[PDB]
């Protein structure tokens, strides 16, 4: 029963390490022209999410993984949700920065495209509100706990 005990201890350590990583994971902030806080380390966050997802998927194939099946399923669901949210948010930050750079240096762009300028201003206000909310709660779990995020 020594091998079974070692496998159970390894699975418990896996769950504890995953929970500790989820609790200690935080969203880095970088100043952007004194307007908002763009997320820093997006590549590192994506790599960490991919590594956690791959580790969970590969660990859900062993013979002694049925002891913490519910915890493994919950961790996999949380990791998938966090990965999807980060994948959406990285594109959101990139597109918002592109739109802000496009519409910031141009003064007659509002006159040329008024509806597009108004839509961009509304999207920029929404992005600023989201950035303020993310800065208020920099924790990854706190950010993911916002309804409708």
């Amino acid at each position: 029963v020594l091998l079974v005990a070692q496998g159970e201890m390894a699975l418990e350590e896996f769950l504890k390490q995953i929970r500790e990583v989820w609790n200690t994971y935080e969203l880095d902030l970088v100043n952007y022209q004194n307007k908002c806080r763009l997320i820093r380390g997006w590549d590192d966050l994506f790599n960490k999410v991919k590594e956690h997802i791959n580790s969970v998927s590969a660990m859900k194939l062993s013979p002694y993984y049925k002891v913490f099946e519910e915890d493994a399923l919950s961790w996999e669901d949380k990791l998938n949700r966090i990965m999807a949210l980060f994948d959406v948010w990285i594109d959101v930050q990139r597109r918002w920065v592109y739109l802000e750079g496009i519409f910031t240096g141009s003064a007659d762009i509002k006159h040329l495209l008024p509806v597009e300028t108004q839509r961009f201003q509304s999207i920029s206000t929404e992005f600023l509100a989201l950035m303020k909310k993310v800065s208020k709660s920099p924790l990854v779990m706190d950010v993911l706990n916002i309804q409708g995020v």
């Binding site: 390894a10 590594e51 791959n54």
Partner: protein
């Protein structure tokens, strides 16, 4: 044992010259040993020979000699074969433990090592001409146990113990100079 651990790199002529030198001088040292040594038949048996021949492996003196070298290794070997069927053999045999892969540009090094040796698996690397630096401490197979948690010095993360672990390495270029 001297042949197994020493004459794994030399060609047939130098290998036999070394064996004859060892045998002649050990005879000069007055130690009892057989003269008509058949080391290949002595180190294996007919059932495993037929198993090897049924499997994808050639059949002559040097190839069966290196085959009996592969069976009872202690350090994980570096096979230099134009065919390259050791990966096929290891996926045929040790598929029961969900073998994983690691190379140079894998985005996870410490996380990959800790997860792999955490839930338990063997390892195998492809394109072995560019060597894998992950393989150094597990290649050593050193032990540092903390009371049920076996850990070795690679990465900031911690690992566990996996009983089933075989490493088979490959080299296509017959003229390379490995690091010392």
């Amino acid at each position: 044992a001297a042949f197994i651990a020493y004459a794994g790199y030399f060609d047939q002529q130098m290998r036999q010259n070394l064996f004859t030198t060892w045998s002649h001088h050990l005879q000069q040292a007055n130690i009892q040993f057989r003269t008509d040594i058949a080391r290949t038949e002595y180190l294996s048996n007919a059932d495993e020979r037929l198993r090897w021949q049924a499997s994808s492996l050639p059949a002559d003196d040097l190839c069966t000699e290196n085959a009996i070298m592969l069976k009872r290794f202690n350090r994980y070997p570096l096979i230099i074969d134009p065919s390259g069927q050791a990966t096929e053999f290891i996926m045929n045999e040790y598929k029961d433990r969900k073998i994983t892969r690691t190379s140079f540009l894998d985005d996870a090094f410490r996380k990959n090592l800790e997860s792999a040796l955490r839930f338990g698996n063997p390892l195998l690397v492809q394109d072995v001409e560019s060597y894998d630096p992950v393989l150094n401490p597990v290649l050593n197979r050193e032990v540092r146990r903390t009371g049920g948690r076996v850990l070795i010095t690679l990465g900031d993360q911690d690992i566990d113990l996996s009983p089933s672990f075989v490493i088979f390495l490959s080299t296509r270029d017959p003229t390379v100079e490995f690091p010392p």
